[PDB]
């Protein structure tokens, strides 16, 4: 595609520049080009890929929620009819969001996941697969159940690997649990599962902190505080 003539290293260099300039659409396009070179990604490169698309899809999701709220209010008793424009524009934003999710899922399927053998990369990519199916689920209204189950299945494979191959304080394991817990709470209508997962994850990490350096301790406790914040919110 458009990045096919640029060196892999130049794409990564430009992705880092785009991040500094808060140009996340550019950043995502550069990292897509880097993935399409066909080589596996390093730890730093995987995080550039995720940062880029998380920011792009984050803005789209926030816009979709604003528009969906306006649309719902327009269907309340006593709302003046304003025509098709709200629905049309919500659909436009929805379609662009789905396209981004499809692009990320396509990169994971061709061929990031199948080449990823180490626990750190495989779990990272399967968490991403679960995350982007979850974003598809947020806007889904015949295929909603299958979209939900695709998210669940990706998260579950990642959980299984992370519990076997990673310590309980591993930041990827913790963030995977954080997100799968939110999936349970607000996608799968399973708040009790969400709370159980967050509390167990928190407690098992707490008990492993003593093994860590100062820097690793800061990394793990940062994510543990996100789990605690969610538990406080939900209980």
């Amino acid at each position: 595609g458009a990045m096919g003539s640029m060196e892999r290293a130049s794409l990564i260099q430009k992705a880092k520049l785009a991040e500094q300039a808060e140009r996340y659409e550019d950043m995502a396009a550069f990292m897509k080009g880097a993935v399409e070179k066909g080589e596996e990604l390093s730890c730093e490169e995987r995080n550039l890929l995720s940062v880029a698309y998380k920011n792009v899809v984050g803005g789209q999701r926030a816009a979709w929620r604003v528009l969906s709220s306006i649309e719902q209010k327009s269907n309340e008793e006593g709302s003046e009819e304003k025509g098709p424009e709200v629905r049309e524009y919500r659909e436009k934003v929805e379609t662009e969001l789905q396209g981004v999710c499809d692009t990320v899922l396509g990169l994971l399927d061709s061929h990031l996941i199948k080449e990823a053998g180490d626990a750190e990369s495989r779990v990272f990519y399967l968490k991403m697969k679960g995350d982007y199916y979850r974003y598809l689920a947020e806007v889904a209204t015949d295929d909603k159940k299958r979209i939900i189950d695709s998210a669940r299945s990706a998260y579950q494979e990642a959980m299984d690997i992370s519990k076997k191959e990673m310590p309980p304080t591993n930041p990827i394991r913790l963030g995977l649990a954080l997100n799968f817990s939110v999936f349970h709470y607000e996608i799968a209508n399973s708040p009790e599962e969400a709370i159980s997962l967050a509390k167990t994850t928190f407690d098992e990490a707490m008990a492993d902190l003593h093994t860590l350096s100062e820097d690793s301790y800061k990394d793990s406790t940062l994510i543990m505080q996100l789990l605690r914040d969610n538990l406080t919110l939900w209980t």
Binding site: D131, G175, N179, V182, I223, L226, D229, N230, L233, W234
Partner: peptide, 6 residues
């Protein structure tokens, strides 16, 4: 306050 994902 909104729940966290990362």
């Amino acid at each position: 306050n909104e729940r966290h994902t990362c």
